[PDB]
Design a protein around this ligand. Sequence first.
Ligand SMILES: *[C@@H]1O[C@H](CO)[C@@H](O[C@@H]2O[C@H](CO)[C@@H](O[C@@H]3O[C@H](CO)[C@@H](O)[C@H](O)[C@@H]3O)[C@H](O)[C@H]2NC(C)=O)[C@H](O)[C@H]1NC(C)=O
Ligand SMILES: *[C@@H]1O[C@H](CO)[C@@H](O[C@@H]2O[C@H](CO)[C@@H](O[C@@H]3O[C@H](CO)[C@@H](O)[C@H](O)[C@@H]3O)[C@H](O)[C@H]2NC(C)=O)[C@H](O)[C@H]1NC(C)=O
Ligand SMILES: *[C@@H]1O[C@H](CO)[C@@H](O[C@@H]2O[C@H](CO)[C@@H](O)[C@H](O)[C@H]2NC(C)=O)[C@H](O)[C@H]1NC(C)=O
Ligand SMILES: *[C@@H]1O[C@H](CO)[C@@H](O[C@@H]2O[C@H](CO)[C@@H](O)[C@H](O)[C@H]2NC(C)=O)[C@H](O)[C@H]1NC(C)=O
Ligand SMILES: *[C@@H]1O[C@H](CO)[C@@H](O[C@@H]2O[C@H](CO)[C@@H](O)[C@H](O)[C@H]2NC(C)=O)[C@H](O)[C@H]1NC(C)=O
Ligand SMILES: *[C@@H]1O[C@H](CO)[C@@H](O[C@@H]2O[C@H](CO)[C@@H](O)[C@H](O)[C@H]2NC(C)=O)[C@H](O)[C@H]1NC(C)=O
Ligand SMILES: *[C@@H]1O[C@H](CO)[C@@H](O[C@@H]2O[C@H](CO)[C@@H](O)[C@H](O)[C@H]2NC(C)=O)[C@H](O)[C@H]1NC(C)=O
Ligand SMILES: *[C@@H]1O[C@H](CO)[C@@H](O[C@@H]2O[C@H](CO)[C@@H](O)[C@H](O)[C@H]2NC(C)=O)[C@H](O)[C@H]1NC(C)=O
Ligand SMILES: *[C@@H]1O[C@H](CO)[C@@H](O[C@@H]2O[C@H](CO)[C@@H](O)[C@H](O)[C@H]2NC(C)=O)[C@H](O)[C@H]1NC(C)=O
Ligand SMILES: *[C@@H]1O[C@H](CO)[C@@H](O[C@@H]2O[C@H](CO)[C@@H](O)[C@H](O)[C@H]2NC(C)=O)[C@H](O)[C@H]1NC(C)=O
Ligand code: NAG
Ligand code: NAG
Ligand code: NAG
Ligand code: NAG
Ligand code: NAG
Ligand code: NAG
Ligand code: NAG
Ligand code: NAG
Ligand code: NAG
Ligand code: NAG
Lengths: 175, 440, 196, 245, 98
Amino acid sequence: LTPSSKRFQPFQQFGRDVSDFTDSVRDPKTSEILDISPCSFGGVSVITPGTNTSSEVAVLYQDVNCTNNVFQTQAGCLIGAEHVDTSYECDIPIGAGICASYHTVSSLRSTSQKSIVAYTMSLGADSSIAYSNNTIAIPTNFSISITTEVMPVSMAKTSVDCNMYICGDSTECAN
Amino acid sequence: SSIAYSNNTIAIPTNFSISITTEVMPVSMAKTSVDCNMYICGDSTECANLLLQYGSFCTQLNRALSGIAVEQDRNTREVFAQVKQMYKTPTLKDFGGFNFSQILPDPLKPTKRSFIEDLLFNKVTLADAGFMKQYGECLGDINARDLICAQKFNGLTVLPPLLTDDMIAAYTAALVSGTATAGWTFGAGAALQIPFAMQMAYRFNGIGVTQNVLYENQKQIANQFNKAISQIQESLTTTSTALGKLQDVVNQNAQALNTLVKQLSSNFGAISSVLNDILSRLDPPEAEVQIDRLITGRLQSLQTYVTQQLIRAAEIRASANLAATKMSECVLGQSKRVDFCGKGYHLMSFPQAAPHGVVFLHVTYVPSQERNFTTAPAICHEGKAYFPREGVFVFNGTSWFITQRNFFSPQIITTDNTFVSGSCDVVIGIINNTVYDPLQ
Amino acid sequence: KLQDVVNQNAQALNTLVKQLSSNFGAISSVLNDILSRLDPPEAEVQIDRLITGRLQSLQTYVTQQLIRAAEIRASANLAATKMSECVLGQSKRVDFCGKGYHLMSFPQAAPHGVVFLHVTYVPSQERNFTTAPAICHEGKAYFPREGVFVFNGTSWFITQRNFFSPQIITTDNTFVSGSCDVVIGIINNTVYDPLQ
Amino acid sequence: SNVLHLVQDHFLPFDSNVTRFITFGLNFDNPIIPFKDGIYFAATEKSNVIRGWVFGSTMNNKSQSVIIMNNSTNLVIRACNFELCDNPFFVVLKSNNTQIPSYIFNNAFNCTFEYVSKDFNLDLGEKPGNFKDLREFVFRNKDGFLHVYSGYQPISAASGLPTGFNALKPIFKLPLGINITNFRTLLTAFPPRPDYWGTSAAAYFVGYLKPTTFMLKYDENGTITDAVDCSQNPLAELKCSVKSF
Amino acid sequence: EIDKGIYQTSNFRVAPSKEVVRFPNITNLCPFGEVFNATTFPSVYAWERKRISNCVADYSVLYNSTSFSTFKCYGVSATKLNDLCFSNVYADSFVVKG
Ligand SMILES: *[C@@H]1O[C@H](CO)[C@@H](O[C@@H]2O[C@H](CO)[C@@H](O[C@@H]3O[C@H](CO)[C@@H](O)[C@H](O)[C@@H]3O)[C@H](O)[C@H]2NC(C)=O)[C@H](O)[C@H]1NC(C)=O
Ligand SMILES: *[C@@H]1O[C@H](CO)[C@@H](O[C@@H]2O[C@H](CO)[C@@H](O[C@@H]3O[C@H](CO)[C@@H](O)[C@H](O)[C@@H]3O)[C@H](O)[C@H]2NC(C)=O)[C@H](O)[C@H]1NC(C)=O
Ligand SMILES: *[C@@H]1O[C@H](CO)[C@@H](O[C@@H]2O[C@H](CO)[C@@H](O)[C@H](O)[C@H]2NC(C)=O)[C@H](O)[C@H]1NC(C)=O
Ligand SMILES: *[C@@H]1O[C@H](CO)[C@@H](O[C@@H]2O[C@H](CO)[C@@H](O)[C@H](O)[C@H]2NC(C)=O)[C@H](O)[C@H]1NC(C)=O
Ligand SMILES: *[C@@H]1O[C@H](CO)[C@@H](O[C@@H]2O[C@H](CO)[C@@H](O)[C@H](O)[C@H]2NC(C)=O)[C@H](O)[C@H]1NC(C)=O
Ligand SMILES: *[C@@H]1O[C@H](CO)[C@@H](O[C@@H]2O[C@H](CO)[C@@H](O)[C@H](O)[C@H]2NC(C)=O)[C@H](O)[C@H]1NC(C)=O
Ligand SMILES: *[C@@H]1O[C@H](CO)[C@@H](O[C@@H]2O[C@H](CO)[C@@H](O)[C@H](O)[C@H]2NC(C)=O)[C@H](O)[C@H]1NC(C)=O
Ligand SMILES: *[C@@H]1O[C@H](CO)[C@@H](O[C@@H]2O[C@H](CO)[C@@H](O)[C@H](O)[C@H]2NC(C)=O)[C@H](O)[C@H]1NC(C)=O
Ligand SMILES: *[C@@H]1O[C@H](CO)[C@@H](O[C@@H]2O[C@H](CO)[C@@H](O)[C@H](O)[C@H]2NC(C)=O)[C@H](O)[C@H]1NC(C)=O
Ligand SMILES: *[C@@H]1O[C@H](CO)[C@@H](O[C@@H]2O[C@H](CO)[C@@H](O)[C@H](O)[C@H]2NC(C)=O)[C@H](O)[C@H]1NC(C)=O
Ligand SMILES: *[C@@H]1O[C@H](CO)[C@@H](O)[C@H](O)[C@H]1NC(C)=O
Ligand SMILES: *[C@@H]1O[C@H](CO)[C@@H](O)[C@H](O)[C@H]1NC(C)=O
Ligand SMILES: *[C@@H]1O[C@H](CO)[C@@H](O)[C@H](O)[C@H]1NC(C)=O
Ligand SMILES: *[C@@H]1O[C@H](CO)[C@@H](O)[C@H](O)[C@H]1NC(C)=O
Ligand SMILES: *[C@@H]1O[C@H](CO)[C@@H](O)[C@H](O)[C@H]1NC(C)=O
Ligand SMILES: *[C@@H]1O[C@H](CO)[C@@H](O)[C@H](O)[C@H]1NC(C)=O
Ligand SMILES: *[C@@H]1O[C@H](CO)[C@@H](O)[C@H](O)[C@H]1NC(C)=O
Ligand SMILES: *[C@@H]1O[C@H](CO)[C@@H](O)[C@H](O)[C@H]1NC(C)=O
Ligand SMILES: *[C@@H]1O[C@H](CO)[C@@H](O)[C@H](O)[C@H]1NC(C)=O
Ligand SMILES: *[C@@H]1O[C@H](CO)[C@@H](O)[C@H](O)[C@H]1NC(C)=O
């Protein structure tokens, strides 16, 4: 319940939105209009390695500004993952350019324990090529490469018996 | 139009123009997820227990929506991440007189994206304007009935794309810089540096025009290239519906979520659509009949949303596959397919990042200023028939010559430009002329 | 990918089975209990609710199957196109059959799919070379015919772009057009004539 | 607030035929107008010539009737078995500008309902110029209740019903439980000379409500500012279908 | 068992901790004696309607004073009668035969 700027006519006591959800009400004892809002407004996701791999979990709250680790991403407030400045290939896509993985981090001494780490993913290898008005690169050798491409062609063909699925061996249900 | 036919008139273009056209292709669409309990029951424990007793098939719904979301991130990666190595933007952006300034990021500009890309992002108006909305923000913005707050209060969420807009523009800059420096070679294998003017000469050879046409007209072609880029820039600056295809995609996604919210005011054979009104007025036995009707109708509404989302994602997938094909065939190489990359003979293509899509600038060779000529299938020199080698015989109004079809460049008919087979009587339209021999 | 397909199919059936345990506003999902406990008039309501729910479940299954079949149809059309263009011929389309210049392709059967082995030509071990657009021999400009002018370091040659094979610049490897002043990066060199 | 609301009820259709009854000169219109399903009542007047109505079925003492007349002091709603006079009116002297007692009914018996409003002052004086005030009323009889919706607008029209839009707010829901098929307006009279009658310029308009679909528009403050008659024309039925103006 | 990845769980939920009951200020009891213990009742054709306002509808006082052979509610629940506030409530009185 919050204070509201809505004005209610003497003959009005409740107000509804486009969803017909009651969002405004005039308090009986004090004739003040109050706004009613839902208690649940969270976008929550859970990042986990394999269950057999570990039972540790990192939780992302999409709608929360962060102001153990509590790192703030553009996707949301991320809790339970260390932020590493190194850029790797994406392993678990958090979003907004942020990815997560399970990397061995020596937080204390040399523990050699694995933890969930969040990082900005690497787009690709960095390269520099020189341009001029009179240099050309001509290959002096070649290789024969063989690559694989896997393409689905068909899927399982299925049929359904209606009387069996809906009614089974029931004559009353069949009728 | 009317065109004349005869057995000996051929039209050979005497000039050409460099044309640059735009192709707008959707690539991805909004990734959405649904909270089953929030949409159907809200913050109601009585409804939640009835929804549990009721067969809840909305883990199937979220499974379908999650598959859509992963495909949307796949779509962008297949289109833009085809380059293996990121190529640094050249410090100088004028290769042989061809101005690449507009389609390359400006180091002084803070937006780290091309000038043309900035115009495209200004065209399409996005509804989300960010993927973070705090609880205090919507509470303080209750007076204005924000649609995003309304749908987020009902369990409808929009997930951010994995690749941020700056990352996609980074891929585009590497693609443009690689083409301007390494040409077509980096598309298939390691990048091989080649001068840009020679690259243009190679591409002119691909469409059947000799190299000398490019080099003798390098200043004219470069100027035509620069003016064509400017016309694209001017056309995008003025308001238009060129990017309507991308706008249509974002409109459909917002419309679907707003329809979902408005369907909560729907009765489905029940006394009221307000769950609190029913629960405040009836016993659990009598309210169970009404709540079950609201559960069934609201579940069907979510089923309809997901099914339409699946069909829409199929269309986006087909569009993104075409964009991924056009990136490999029109940008990373030269295409002989007719009308696949622009109108006219394809020279090169430049990708540009767009909101939820890609824009292709196709550079094409357009012949113009044709001239009519008298033509013969072959030449009878001395009892022997001479056929042209990669050309067509043209009278020119004075003496028979041989020229390439696309561009008119008369050449003396010699034994090098022609080959001899058979006799003179077999060919129908054969005429008599001399064939010059260099050794004579 | 192939595995994914089959997995979905299995899931699409198993879910169906589990949805038989679902009440849809009814007292129970067990038809036998309702039939053993109520008269036909009172059991009709519950049985109708169960019928509606199960029919909706079957509708959902068939719709999802239709969409998946459309996706499989698109994939199979692409596979047939690749069989026609990469296996039965040679493709000049970039990246349509493997990475690099396409040499050939070999099909292999796979469970509910096809695996294409694309044999391609990949250049390597490149070398930098001074190069010129044309050669000025005697007031005339010579442009290479299917090649590029390159500099070993001492003398000018003409070579194919993909593989380096230096050849003596002759009138057979080049063609003459125009004068020398028009070309920008034109340089001076001799053009060998076999006739002389 | 800030919504478009589609509702089906008994509404006065847009551009409907509306019969006019005037009081000026030698005609003092007091007919028995049928009530039908419901009526839209609008009075154009510069002086308080209109005082109320009498609703009933037989308009005599053989059946119950309700009178909503507004005398000079307060509003009186009286549902009784009335021996109604065939020509009921109030009387106010044109020069004296004072109200003297007048008869609407001879005798009232077996009465079932009574309501008296708070005391207020009403101006009985004749006024010059054009019509100054527009008072709009909707009367709906459903499930034993008489619903009254009222609205007021300042106008300057010399004749006819001015065009415009006005949302009437609910003022009364009278539990009468009477059969209503007819109604008669109660106007005041301005007799200059005894044994003779007179009239002051005033007009009222009667329109009949019908069950129709309307799309109401709510502004920020919750008021209704515009509406669309979805049955008026194919363009209007398009607007309601797409829920936009 | 869960494979590696990121999964969308339920939306963040807040469990209510306090109750807030707000009724208008009413100090009187409803005229149960005036309605159910009237000396005279009208005929069914001339049934009598009376308005009720500004009162607490505590029908537990009806116990031990009156006994109803018929009591049926429509549009509402009997067990819900104690937790509600009613608008425009009228009582119609008459006499019929069994
Ligand atoms: C093919 O068409 C193009 C037009 O697209 C022709 O280019 C035009 O060439 C003329 C003459 O060379 C140019 O006129 C010149 O204008 C400058 C001022 O800019 C003036 O100083 C010169 O004295 C001369 O009048 C014209 O500007 C130019 N147009 C463009 C757009 O470049 C080209 O000549 C045509 N080629 C053939 C073989 O017909
Ligand atoms: C307009 O109609 C109203 C309602 O009928 C009149 O108000 C009521 O008029 C009656 C009769 O004059 C009043 O009864 C009188 O009460 C006094 C004591 O207050 C008593 O001494 C008299 O013998 C008589 O019984 C009644 O009180 C009065 N009520 C109110 C609220 O004022 C009103 O007078 C009428 N005005 C006219 C004639 O324009
Ligand atoms: C009904 O009673 C409540 C409780 O007495 C009143 O609320 C209080 O009113 C006093 C005087 O206005 C204030 O000083 C208190 O701060 C109020 N407390 C609350 C609970 O807000 C309420 O005003 C009364 N309402 C009516 C209809 O008179
Ligand atoms: C979260 O809130 C903070 C403010 O509390 C926003 O800005 C940060 O403010 C602090 C303190 O002034 C600065 O030291 C930081 O540099 C600010 N920037 C960031 C990005 O941390 C912050 O922008 C908010 N984050 C979001 C995404 O809403
Ligand atoms: C390539 O095009 C850009 C844009 O037309 C040129 O940049 C402009 O240069 C002129 C002259 O210096 C300035 O007046 C403009 O303000 C510049 N515009 C921008 C956007 O920077 C650029 O000079 C061209 N490059 C070449 C050498 O052709
Ligand atoms: C091209 O030349 C040939 C031979 O010089 C011409 O063929 C001769 O035509 C004349 C005219 O009728 C005949 O009398 C000869 O018998 C032909 N000679 C042979 C070997 O057939 C031919 O007519 C010439 N074509 C043109 C168009 O002038
Ligand atoms: C320039 O190209 C020529 C031709 O390939 C190279 O000259 C050859 O060098 C080898 C080794 O000394 C000799 O055995 C051949 O007889 C030479 N051929 C000719 C035609 O002279 C030379 O190596 C190249 N220059 C550089 C710097 O690589
Ligand atoms: C290629 O040879 C030509 C002619 O042998 C050179 O052109 C001459 O250059 C000199 C030097 O300035 C001038 O004085 C002459 O007038 C030019 N002759 C003509 C006909 O224009 C040319 O410079 C040579 N190129 C190189 C790169 O050495
Ligand atoms: C009901 O109204 C009728 C008609 O006005 C009354 O009948 C009149 O009664 C008077 C005596 O009170 C006679 O002088 C008239 O001649 C009668 N007229 C007619 C047409 O019959 C009747 O008395 C009224 N009943 C009441 C007041 O209860
Ligand atoms: C709702 O009511 C408020 C308050 O009467 C209106 O705000 C006033 O509008 C008038 C006319 O524009 C201004 O002169 C006042 O200064 C405003 N006061 C305030 C508190 O801002 C508001 O315009 C009304 N809204 C609508 C659309 O009817
Ligand atoms: C999980 O990992 C452990 C250790 O490698 C292995 O023994 C176990 O079989 C794995 N289980 C699954 C679910 O793959
Ligand atoms: C080639 O580039 C260099 C460095 O910018 C410059 O000095 C030289 O003059 C250029 N030559 C040509 C052919 O433009
Ligand atoms: C070629 O011939 C056609 C048909 O007569 C004519 O329309 C066209 O203008 C001619 N073009 C030239 C350049 O002569
Ligand atoms: C072509 O025709 C023109 C005009 O008849 C003539 O001047 C020219 O010499 C002919 N030959 C060439 C060089 O194309
Ligand atoms: C072209 O057609 C005309 C009309 O039939 C004919 O006279 C002429 O000889 C033909 N020329 C050839 C054979 O090309
Ligand atoms: C060509 O030059 C570049 C530097 O500009 C260098 O990295 C590359 O290895 C050279 N290639 C060869 C082997 O000539
Ligand atoms: C005018 O009205 C007053 C008050 O009712 C009254 O006393 C007076 O006698 C009236 N005069 C006339 C003209 O009847
Ligand atoms: C109505 O009034 C008459 C007298 O005119 C009386 O005889 C009758 O009983 C009354 N009926 C009611 C319902 O009070
Ligand atoms: C009923 O309850 C009242 C108190 O409300 C008590 O005075 C009375 O004795 C009880 N028994 C009756 C009325 O028979
Ligand atoms: C009604 O009042 C009488 C007399 O006080 C009493 O005996 C009777 O029990 C009361 N009944 C009810 C319904 O309270």
